[PDB]
């Protein structure tokens, strides 16, 4: 069980760790988060008490190093930074744990929520969507734009998601215009799965990561990307039986975990009604369709 030690908490801030969150008051004696389950990626995120603008946060995997948070009063945010001296990450942590100035990642043992949300998410792929290679961890915030958003302005601070566009030459084979626009199986299976993502786990991983960026940071381009990747599968007549089943599970936990009050902005009416009621896969998302109907029947 790993630990993220905070130097200090000089400004009042709501701290999130995966789907958990807690309020820290200005200069409260807070020194980090302990008992973080190894074996998963994690996200630690922040919303300043004074400026609800800019939710920001860091994707990390504890196995890839010792990381700690220290507020930077110049740049005005809580920064993640790696402690190379390992006899410091132990000594510093033990002292703070001994003084019990660390909150406990409060996993319920029956709870598989985080695993189900991050099943296919892998840090090596995050670091290629979020380009900044001197850091083992990856910064995301509410305002970052996606590579495709910049096509339609700073590239170094972009989310380099896989560009999907249904009215593009990549998506439409010359001479199969109608076939390929109404049944995107070509685009899904040959272009994206076999060609770009290599396998469904990399596809699902990016999908899951985009959703989590939409949810935790209200990142609009991530929400576009999550819906696009859903829509491509739903609009494909031919999808591996295993992808459909796993998709229904992925989406179910994403919809389950979404704040009931954020549905208006994070959920795209057109895509969901199409996936669940019009698309080829209308009948293949039983769990997702049941939770959607019972939790947000307004949208449909």
């Amino acid at each position: 069980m790993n630990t993220v030690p905070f130097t200090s908490a000089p400004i009042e801030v709501t701290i999130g760790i995966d789907q958990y969150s807690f309020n820290v008051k200005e200069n409260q004696p807070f020194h980090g988060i302990k008992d973080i389950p190894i074996g998963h990626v994690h996200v630690i995120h922040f919303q300043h008490a004074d400026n609800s603008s800019m939710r920001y946060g860091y994707w990390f995997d504890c196995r890839m190093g010792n990381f700690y948070i220290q507020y930077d009063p110049k740049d005005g945010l809580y920064k993640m930074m790696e402690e190379r001296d390992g006899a410091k990450f132990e000594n510093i942590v033990h002292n703070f744990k001994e003084r019990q100035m660390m909150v406990s990642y409060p996993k319920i043992d029956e709870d598989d929520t985080w695993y189900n949300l991050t099943e296919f998410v892998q840090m090596d792929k995050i670091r290629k969507i979020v380009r900044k290679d001197e850091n083992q961890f990856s910064y995301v915030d509410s305002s970052m734009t996606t590579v495709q958003e910049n096509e339609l302005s700073d590239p170094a601070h972009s989310l380099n998601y896989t560009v999907i566009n249904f009215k593009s030459r990549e998506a439409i084979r010359p001479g199969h215009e109608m076939e390929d626009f109404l049944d995107k199986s070509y685009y899904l299976n040959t272009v994206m799965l076999q060609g770009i993502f290599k396998n469904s786990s990399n596809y699902f991983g990016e999908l899951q990561f985009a959703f989590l960026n939409a949810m935790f940071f209200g990142n609009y381009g991530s929400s576009l990307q999550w819906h696009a990747m859903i829509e491509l599968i739903c609009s494909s007549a031919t999808v591996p039986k295993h992808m459909l089943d796993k998709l229904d599970e992925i989406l179910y936990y994403q919809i389950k975990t979404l704040p009931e009050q954020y549905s208006d902005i994070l959920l795209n009416e057109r895509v969901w009604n199409i996936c669940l009621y019009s698309s080829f896969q209308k009948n293949s998302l039983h769990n997702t369709e049941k939770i959607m109907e019972n939790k947000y029947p307004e949208l449909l």
Binding site: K167, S168, R169, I172, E177, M178, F181
Partner: protein, 237 residues
């Protein structure tokens, strides 16, 4: 974006553009079967592709054979329209290719956009005008070449005949839409009007009668009376 009464004069500037209308592409007669069920039988159709500036009409005849063995014909027809318009553009020399294509029904937007991905610099636009191009099959010579075709065929016309020698494109289009609007609201009367005086003939290389300027004003007036009337007969006013 979309095309309407405000940006109406854009049609007659010097950017090449085409209207595409697909309302006569997929045409059916509906009938009873021996067993008392209903069936359709398709009849030949056409894509109406018009340059409103020059009057050149590119009339692509849709032969019923294109539908054999096909499902969801009404949807396929929009995609067949798009394929044929795209093929037409590709066949034109570059300096003749349109800079815009305006579809008269918004359902054509996606099919044409996808068929024209190779032409990113051609804008595909809808319109809010309620243009009467469906009445094109009420022009006898157009209907005639369509019904007689036995294979796919592209026939070129100038829908303005020789009018541009005497009037502007703007005025030419206005006359054309007035004639077609009349043919659409009451075909019988519109046609009675156009041929009453048997001394005004249609030249072999033309579609409409050879009216003098003065005779066109009378004609045009008669068409407006018909259109207002039919609007009364239809709303009682």
């Amino acid at each position: 974006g979309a095309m309407n009464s405000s940006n109406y004069a854009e049609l007659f500037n010097n950017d090449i553009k085409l209207f595409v209308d697909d309302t006569n592409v997929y045409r059916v007669t509906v009938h009873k079967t021996f067993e008392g069920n209903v069936a359709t039988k398709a009849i030949n159709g056409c894509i109406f592709t018009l340059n409103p500036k020059t009057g050149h009409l590119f009339l692509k005849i849709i032969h019923t054979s294109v539908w054999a063995g096909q499902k969801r014909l009404s949807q396929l027809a929009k995609w067949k329209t798009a394929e044929e318009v795209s093929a037409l553009v590709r066949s034109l020399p570059k300096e003749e290719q349109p800079k815009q294509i305006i579809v008269t029904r918004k359902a054509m937007l996606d099919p044409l956009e996808v068929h024209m991905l190779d032409f990113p610099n051609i804008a595909i636009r809808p319109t809010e005008l309620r243009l009467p191009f469906s009445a094109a099959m009420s022009i006898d010579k157009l209907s005639d070449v369509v019904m007689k075709a036995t294979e796919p065929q592209m026939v070129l016309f100038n829908i303005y005949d020789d009018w541009l020698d005497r009037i502007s494109s703007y005025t030419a289009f206005s006359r054309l839409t007035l004639l077609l609007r009349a043919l659409k609201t009451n075909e019988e009367s519109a046609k009675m009007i156009l041929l009453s005086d048997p001394t005004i003939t249609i030249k072999s290389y033309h579609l409409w009668p050879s009216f003098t300027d003065e005779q066109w004003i009378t004609i045009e007036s008669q068409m407006r009376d018909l259109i207002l009337t039919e609007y009364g007969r239809k709303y009682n006013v």
